[PDB]
Each structure stands twice: as C-alpha cells, then as structure tokens.
Amino acid sequence: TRITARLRDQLGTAKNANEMFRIFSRFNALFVRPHIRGAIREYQTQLIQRVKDDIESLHDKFKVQYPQSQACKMSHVRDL
Amino acid sequence: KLSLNRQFFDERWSKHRVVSCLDWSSQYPELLVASYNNNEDAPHEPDGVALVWNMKYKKTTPEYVFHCQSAVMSATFAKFHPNLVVGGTYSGQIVLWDNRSNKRTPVQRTPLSAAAHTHPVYCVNVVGTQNAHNLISISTDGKICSWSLDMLSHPQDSMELVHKQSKAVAVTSMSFPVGDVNNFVVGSEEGSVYTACRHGSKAGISEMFEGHQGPITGIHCHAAVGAVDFSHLFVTSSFDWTVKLWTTKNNKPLYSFEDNADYVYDVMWSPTHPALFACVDGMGRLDLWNLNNDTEVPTASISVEGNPALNRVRWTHSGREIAVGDSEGQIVIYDVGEQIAVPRNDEWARFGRTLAEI
C-alpha cells in the first residue's frame, strides 16, 4: 500500500511519456503482483495517449522530407 | 424525539422539482448537496440542478448552484477532491462541478459512448483510501464503470453485471461496507439484492437474494463501527412498503418491517448508533427504528408539514441530524434526540443479542 501511494505521487509529479515510462520502469519487481496492475490500468489511458503524442511527434519528424531536413545537412557535413 | 432544525427551499431553482439525491461532505459536515431533475413547469430552465446548502450559516440562499442540460438522477461530494461535486444524469453523462469555477455548467462530462455509460445513472460513489480512490458509477442497464476523478474521458474499468443466464440487472441503488473497496452490494429493480465483486477472479455478481417482491428503492450497508462488527449487515427499502434487514451470510430475510402503509422510498443506517436506522415513505412519514429498543414499532416518527412525499434521506456524519428531500424540491432537517442518536456502550451487545434472537 505504501508503494501504491508512492506510484500515485510519482505520477503526480511526472507528465511526460518518457519520464512516466522511466518511473514505471523504476518498479521492476512490482509487475508480478496483481494489485498494482489495477493502479497501472488506472493510468493506462493516459499512458497510451502519451505514447500516442510521442508517435505523432515522430511522424511529424518523418513527414519532413529527409533532404529538406537538417539531418541530411549534418550527414553531408560528416561526409555521409 | 425529532426536532425541526432547518428547512431549505429556493424559489427560483428548487421549486416544482423532486429531490433526486442527497449527500453530506466529509471534510465539511455542515455542507449538504442535493439534486433536482427537470421541472415540467419550466421547460426553458435547465433540466438538471444541483444545490449545495450550509448549516453553520443561517442564510436561506443556496451556497452554491449548479445546473446541466440533463436531469440529475444522483449526486455526491468528491471525498478526496473537496472542490468537486460528482453527479449522474438521466442521459448517463457523469457530470462534474468545480466550486472554484464561476461557471455553472459541468467542467467535465463523460462521453455516453459504448465504452462509457449509456443509460440513467442512479448511483455514484468515490471509494478508496487517500492514496487510492475510484469513482464507481452504475446505470440502469446494469453497466458498471470505474472512473478516475482526474480524467472522465474514458472509464478506468467497465463491464456489465449479470447473475444467471446473462440476464441484465437494472441496478437502482448501491452501497458498500465500511472500509471495503472490492466487494459491494447492489439493489436492482427486481426486488433482488446482489452481493457483487468489483475486481478479481469472481468479479461481477456473486450471489442472488430473492427477497423483495417489488422494486428496491434504496440499499444501504451498516456504517457504525465499534466493538462488534456489523458491516456484514445491510438494509433494503422497496416499492412493496417493506423494509428488509439482511446480512451477507444468510440468503433469506433476517427480518422484514411492514408497519408502513405506503411505498417506503429510502432506508439508511445511522453512522454512530449500531441498531438505529431511519426510513422515509411517500405518505410523508420519516420513521426511526431502534432495533435495540424495538424491532416492532417506530422508535420515533415525524411527518413533514402538509405530508409531502419524502423521496431521499441522508444521515449526517455525526448522526445527530437527518436531512430529507421530498417531491417538492424542499429539504427538511431534523435533529435527533441525544437519547436515541447517542449509542451507549451496551447498544452494541444489545444489537448482538437482538440479532441472535431473530
């Protein structure tokens, strides 16, 4: 129960997808117990929508044509 | 004896409306939230209304007003979010009101999609610890959904409740034991209570009770906690004029009260006195029964002036006052005598002996 409260507080701090996944990964051993899985399900909607926001960010980076992107310029700078 | 303490009635808002629900805030025991459905006399007015009154002040005006397009079948305080008031409406949207916001419209309302509720919601509650809290809501289609108060876009959990042969349970009222969060009790319109499990291997309806032969109006579990545990006990009112005292273990009535010559519309335990409980009927009578003193006659009785049909009743947390809402949007508060409300140290053993007797 103490660590369930800590999970609640820790997500009360973190908002970002990457940060929230980090604090999730902090509790490696707690995935076994079928009680904190309910706590995880309580945030699961927020988890999918954050990972969503990340993947539209990646799609925004992708839909930029690579020659037009700065990545091509820096690659050519390094002779790639 | 019951003494009339305070009456609340707003001419602009509460007039020509039924009182749909009642609740007292835990952190503010002097705060009472009440619900009102659509007023036929005022179609242009908002259908759902929810008014929060106060007892520390003697001002008659509603301390806070809220309204919504859908009629509010149920409402309650958010126990761990003191600024928030939760409500379930006729259309099934779980509306939420923040007292800080000057806006009266709900700041949040759930979708009424297939994932969410899709029928009128008559019972909503926030159950859990300060660390963990969950908003359980049930609709008249038997769908039960758990939500987070921070996000009402999509439920935490959702399922549909059945008991045998996949027959939908039209839930009309609901309660919990004190301190319990996984196991709950629901009174449907079947006249059949169901002890049900929220989550786990046996999630859903666990048991049937035959019991009442008409629709259940209210179901409430034991609230007072002390030397002898009585959380396994609960009470059920119904359209059949009868009030049934039951426990989880036994599948049949431990006792049934039928003194009432009218539809008994709500029943509720006292939060302090173990044996005492209250009920309210539609003839206009509020009746206190003290099973320690008597399982035979109302320990106290009182009729509201004009005998308006009493719909909802709510005990205050201290157990020294009872609030009742009638079919005229008019709230009446009665202070209970100290002799009845205050339990003596032997009232617990007295109720144990009484339960042994029956």
Curated annotation (Swiss-Prot), chain A:
It comes from the Eukaryota. It is found in: Cytoplasm, Cytoskeleton. Transmembrane segments: none annotated. Changing I23L: In SMALED1; disrupts dynein complex stability and function. Dynein heavy chains probably consist of an N-terminal stem (which binds cargo and interacts with other dynein components), and the head or motor domain. The motor contains six tandemly-linked AAA domains in the head, which form a ring. A stalk-like structure (formed by two of the coiled coil domains) protrudes between AAA 4 and AAA 5 and terminates in a microtubule-binding site. A seventh domain may also contribute to this ring; it is not clear whether the N-terminus or the C-terminus forms this extra domain. Belongs to the dynein heavy chain family. Cytoplasmic dynein 1 acts as a motor for the intracellular retrograde motility of vesicles and organelles along microtubules. Dynein has ATPase activity; the force-producing power stroke is thought to occur on release of ADP. Plays a role in mitotic spindle assembly and metaphase plate congression. It is linked to Charcot-Marie-Tooth disease, axonal, type 2O: An axonal form of Charcot-Marie-Tooth disease, a disorder of the peripheral nervous system, characterized by progressive weakness and atrophy, initially of the peroneal muscles and later of the distal muscles of the arms. Charcot-Marie-Tooth disease is classified in two main groups on the basis of electrophysiologic properties and histopathology: primary peripheral demyelinating neuropathies (designated CMT1 when they are dominantly inherited) and primary peripheral axonal neuropathies (CMT2). Homodimer. The cytoplasmic dynein 1 complex consists of two catalytic heavy chains (HCs) and a number of non-catalytic subunits presented by intermediate chains (ICs), light intermediate chains (LICs) and light chains (LCs); the composition seems to vary in respect to the IC, LIC and LC composition. The heavy chain homodimer serves as a scaffold for the probable homodimeric assembly of the respective non-catalytic subunits. The ICs and LICs bind directly to the HC dimer and dynein LCs assemble on the IC dimer. Interacts with DYNC1LI1; DYNC1LI1 and DYNC1LI2 bind mutually exclusive to DYNC1H1. This is Cytoplasmic dynein 1 heavy chain 1. It comes from Homo sapiens (Human).
UniProtKB/Swiss-Prot annotation, chain B:
Acts as one of several non-catalytic accessory components of the cytoplasmic dynein 1 complex that are thought to be involved in linking dynein to cargos and to adapter proteins that regulate dynein function. Cytoplasmic dynein 1 acts as a motor for the intracellular retrograde motility of vesicles and organelles along microtubules. The intermediate chains mediate the binding of dynein to dynactin via its 150 kDa component (p150-glued) DCTN1. Involved in membrane-transport, such as Golgi apparatus, late endosomes and lysosomes. This is Cytoplasmic dynein 1 intermediate chain 2. Its main location: cytoplasm. It is found in: Cytoplasm, Cytoskeleton; Cytoplasm. The gene is DYNC1I2. The keyword Cytoplasm applies. GO terms for cellular component: centrosome; cytoplasm; cytoplasmic dynein complex; cytosol; dynein complex; microtubule; vesicle. WD repeats lie at residues 14-63, 67-107, 116-157, 166-206, 211-256, 259-299, 305-344. One of its GO terms (molecular function) is microtubule motor activity. Pyrophosphorylation by 5-diphosphoinositol pentakisphosphate (5-IP7) promotes interaction with DCTN1. Serine pyrophosphorylation is achieved by Mg(2+)-dependent, but enzyme independent transfer of a beta-phosphate from a inositol pyrophosphate to a pre-phosphorylated serine residue. Belongs to the dynein intermediate chain family. Disulfide bonds: none annotated. It comes from Homo sapiens. The keyword Transmembrane does not apply. One of its GO terms (biological process) is transport along microtubule. It is linked to Neurodevelopmental disorder with microcephaly and structural brain anomalies: An autosomal recessive neurodevelopmental disorder characterized by global developmental delay, severe intellectual disability, microcephaly, dysmorphic facial features, and cerebral malformations including simplification of cerebral gyration, agenesis of the corpus callosum, and brainstem and white matter hypoplasia.
